[PDB]
Amino acid sequence: KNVVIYADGVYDMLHLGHMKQLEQAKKLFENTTLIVGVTSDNETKLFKGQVVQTLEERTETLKHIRWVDEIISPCPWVVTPEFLEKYKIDYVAHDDIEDIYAWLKRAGKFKATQRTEGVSTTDLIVRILKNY
Amino acid sequence: KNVVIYADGVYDMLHLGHMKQLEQAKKLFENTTLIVGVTSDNETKLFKGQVVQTLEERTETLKHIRWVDEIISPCPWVVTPEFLEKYKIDYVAHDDIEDIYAWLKRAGKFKATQRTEGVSTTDLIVRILKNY
């Protein structure tokens, strides 16, 4: 009855928005194993942009999050069918936002999870940029 | 066999240092209930200094932390004997750093937990204050 869910991402400066996404993935089915994939520093910088925390720092924080059952760190930048078989993954959970998730959706293996705006560590110091 | 542990604090901009402290408190005994107390905005500002996140924001993040079993939010600024009886608390866990914890230590009810330096959300943007 257990369903293996895979949620990959950068998880830089982990905040409430990330945590709610992990909760959502963890709760997609009654009985789940949530695997979190943490992207490598080099690949994140290459394809996305500057990461603040190292792979080891981003991974260590995730270990403390109630919803996280297993961590693949580092994880591949792009999910492949081979990867899904290797780790026996039933669904990939990711924000949605051509479509790199098209093949997962075609297979019935994609579960959208939603971002929370404004709760980011960026915005909190922008907030604190008012005492002056 | 279950031991009730009470760890109070501000828990502003929760980072790895806080999380490791909560892990330490949670793991003080084999079978524990970890109660986290979150201090009020007004009292924190009064006795400590500016808090970045509201009581509700600081409390909501703690809900996502694996080690947290129960939350008292807001909590009293100062622990009292009456408070320990009300919630059936066996030990208070807090960083140590006259001594407001003297009466707890005298009673056998104090468990020191340790801070982690440098891992704070403050230091991460100080870190990012190098790309320029």
XYZ file of C-alpha atoms in Angstrom:
264
model
C 0.000 0.000 0.000
C 3.067 2.225 0.372
C 3.637 4.721 -2.459
C 7.133 6.067 -3.162
C 7.092 9.816 -3.932
C 10.128 11.667 -5.281
C 10.410 15.438 -4.788
C 13.583 16.973 -6.157
C 14.828 20.531 -5.971
C 17.494 22.906 -4.803
C 16.117 23.470 -1.275
C 18.294 26.595 -0.802
C 17.738 28.506 2.470
C 14.821 26.248 3.393
C 11.687 28.165 4.377
C 7.975 27.623 5.059
C 7.170 27.522 1.330
C 9.478 24.537 0.842
C 8.177 22.867 3.974
C 4.566 23.107 2.841
C 5.531 21.605 -0.518
C 7.218 18.695 1.235
C 4.116 18.245 3.410
C 1.958 18.236 0.282
C 4.091 15.603 -1.437
C 4.241 13.515 1.731
C 0.437 13.625 2.029
C -0.428 12.757 -1.605
C -1.452 9.265 -0.462
C -2.361 7.683 2.847
C 0.884 5.671 3.124
C 3.935 7.165 1.419
C 7.696 7.175 1.437
C 8.873 10.657 0.541
C 12.290 10.712 -1.131
C 13.796 14.189 -1.460
C 16.389 14.823 -4.175
C 18.873 17.648 -3.524
C 20.532 19.125 -6.612
C 24.307 19.475 -6.905
C 26.045 22.841 -6.433
C 27.685 22.773 -9.876
C 24.498 21.907 -11.760
C 22.361 24.401 -9.826
C 24.822 27.215 -10.604
C 25.020 26.097 -14.235
C 21.295 25.875 -15.041
C 19.593 28.073 -12.431
C 21.850 30.517 -10.642
C 23.810 31.211 -7.513
C 23.059 28.936 -4.573
C 23.664 30.332 -1.118
C 24.117 27.082 0.815
C 26.368 24.162 -0.093
C 24.964 20.773 -0.981
C 25.897 19.536 2.471
C 24.208 22.473 4.220
C 21.016 22.155 2.141
C 20.891 18.403 2.752
C 21.532 18.625 6.484
C 18.599 20.997 7.041
C 16.196 18.698 5.145
C 17.120 15.879 7.531
C 15.272 17.818 10.261
C 11.959 18.140 8.387
C 9.142 15.912 9.592
C 7.894 14.943 6.145
C 11.258 13.781 4.736
C 11.778 10.026 4.814
C 14.826 9.548 2.553
C 17.247 11.877 0.796
C 19.110 11.375 -2.479
C 21.935 13.914 -2.313
C 23.134 14.934 -4.774
C 20.377 13.968 -7.192
C 20.402 14.070 -10.996
C 19.418 17.368 -12.543
C 16.932 15.639 -14.885
C 14.698 12.723 -13.895
C 14.890 9.744 -16.278
C 12.814 6.553 -16.611
C 15.929 4.618 -15.507
C 16.063 6.683 -12.310
C 12.419 5.845 -11.524
C 13.110 2.119 -11.849
C 16.350 2.244 -9.834
C 14.629 3.806 -6.783
C 11.162 2.229 -7.359
C 9.521 5.658 -7.540
C 5.774 5.720 -8.124
C 5.276 9.479 -8.599
C 7.395 12.598 -9.083
C 6.108 15.610 -7.104
C 7.225 19.043 -8.278
C 5.862 22.532 -8.912
C 4.605 22.867 -12.481
C 4.941 26.550 -13.419
C 8.801 22.546 -23.845
C 7.332 20.820 -20.771
C 10.084 18.779 -19.092
C 7.367 17.010 -17.094
C 5.318 16.020 -20.178
C 6.602 12.419 -20.208
C 5.866 12.034 -16.495
C 2.312 13.318 -16.928
C 1.820 11.050 -19.944
C 2.757 8.073 -17.751
C 0.430 9.034 -14.867
C 3.488 9.625 -12.674
C 3.432 13.402 -12.065
C 1.901 15.101 -9.012
C 1.823 18.886 -8.952
C 2.729 20.608 -5.713
C 2.253 24.341 -5.142
C 4.629 27.104 -4.083
C 3.851 29.586 -1.314
C 4.688 33.157 -2.298
C 6.193 35.761 0.018
C 7.384 33.468 2.821
C 10.901 33.264 1.426
C 14.107 34.013 3.331
C 14.733 36.716 0.684
C 11.531 38.517 1.633
C 12.220 38.376 5.357
C 15.317 40.512 5.182
C 13.503 42.738 2.657
C 10.934 42.973 5.457
C 13.630 43.794 8.048
C 14.783 46.465 5.590
C 12.220 48.771 7.236
C 13.681 49.544 10.718
C 15.599 52.289 8.828
C 8.584 5.540 30.554
C 7.775 8.690 28.573
C 9.583 11.853 29.710
C 8.095 15.285 28.982
C 10.766 17.795 27.878
C 10.074 21.521 27.558
C 12.275 23.660 25.296
C 11.278 27.303 25.114
C 12.705 30.104 23.025
C 12.126 32.697 20.370
C 12.793 30.442 17.347
C 13.203 33.475 15.031
C 14.222 32.665 11.430
C 14.644 28.984 12.284
C 17.980 27.550 11.156
C 20.162 24.450 11.564
C 21.416 25.620 14.973
C 17.867 25.653 16.345
C 17.075 22.341 14.704
C 20.063 20.619 16.281
C 19.038 21.977 19.683
C 15.541 20.581 19.219
C 17.048 17.233 18.181
C 19.220 17.275 21.300
C 16.275 17.977 23.596
C 14.152 15.368 21.834
C 16.908 12.767 22.283
C 17.679 13.408 25.984
C 15.872 10.165 26.857
C 14.820 7.079 24.946
C 11.090 7.936 25.015
C 10.220 11.633 25.165
C 7.511 14.127 24.398
C 9.151 17.350 23.287
C 7.056 20.440 24.017
C 8.343 23.610 22.357
C 7.433 26.982 23.872
C 7.388 29.960 21.484
C 7.786 33.378 23.107
C 5.354 36.225 22.443
C 6.241 39.106 20.100
C 5.698 41.783 22.762
C 7.795 40.057 25.422
C 10.607 39.170 23.008
C 10.855 42.802 21.856
C 10.691 44.002 25.462
C 13.390 41.782 26.999
C 15.558 40.692 24.058
C 15.197 42.761 20.917
C 13.622 42.985 17.514
C 12.069 39.777 16.214
C 11.873 39.354 12.469
C 9.006 36.857 12.256
C 5.625 37.087 13.969
C 4.565 34.612 16.612
C 2.385 32.882 14.049
C 5.204 32.636 11.494
C 7.709 31.316 14.064
C 5.187 28.770 15.338
C 4.130 27.559 11.903
C 7.708 26.724 10.885
C 8.293 24.693 14.078
C 5.281 22.544 13.178
C 7.358 21.151 10.285
C 10.333 20.025 12.400
C 10.647 16.294 12.979
C 11.588 16.534 16.645
C 8.672 18.759 17.735
C 5.789 16.891 19.340
C 3.723 19.706 20.901
C 3.872 23.494 20.827
C 2.846 25.988 23.506
C 2.461 29.257 21.602
C 2.762 31.807 22.994
C 4.590 30.560 26.074
C 5.395 32.435 29.287
C 8.601 34.425 29.250
C 9.711 32.881 32.572
C 9.190 29.240 33.545
C 7.548 28.767 36.962
C 6.993 25.697 39.168
C 3.243 26.121 38.517
C 3.882 25.895 34.770
C 5.798 22.619 35.215
C 2.891 21.072 37.118
C 0.237 22.342 34.686
C 1.909 20.663 31.670
C 3.477 17.720 33.599
C 6.972 18.703 32.459
C 9.831 16.529 33.675
C 12.779 18.602 32.405
C 13.418 22.045 30.924
C 15.952 21.999 28.057
C 17.658 25.286 27.219
C 21.083 26.703 26.384
C 22.921 27.751 29.540
C 25.309 30.551 28.536
C 21.939 35.724 38.613
C 21.243 32.294 37.082
C 17.569 32.144 36.059
C 17.958 28.371 35.721
C 19.391 27.895 39.244
C 16.082 26.675 40.717
C 15.618 24.207 37.858
C 19.120 22.798 38.329
C 18.568 22.582 42.088
C 15.481 20.443 41.427
C 17.224 18.091 38.959
C 14.975 19.426 36.189
C 17.402 21.289 33.891
C 19.026 19.815 30.771
C 21.583 21.928 28.946
C 21.429 21.996 25.170
C 24.136 23.573 23.010
C 24.046 26.251 20.323
C 25.705 25.864 16.927
C 27.666 28.954 15.916
C 27.850 30.367 12.398
C 24.912 28.504 10.839
C 22.518 31.379 11.435
C 20.325 33.040 8.808
C 22.193 36.273 9.678
C 25.509 34.744 8.647
C 24.178 33.358 5.380
C 23.398 36.734 3.905
C 26.685 38.015 5.381
C 28.137 35.122 3.377
C 26.223 36.162 0.228
C 27.653 39.637 0.846
C 30.705 38.494 -1.148
C 29.472 38.265 -4.793
C 30.286 42.023 -4.850
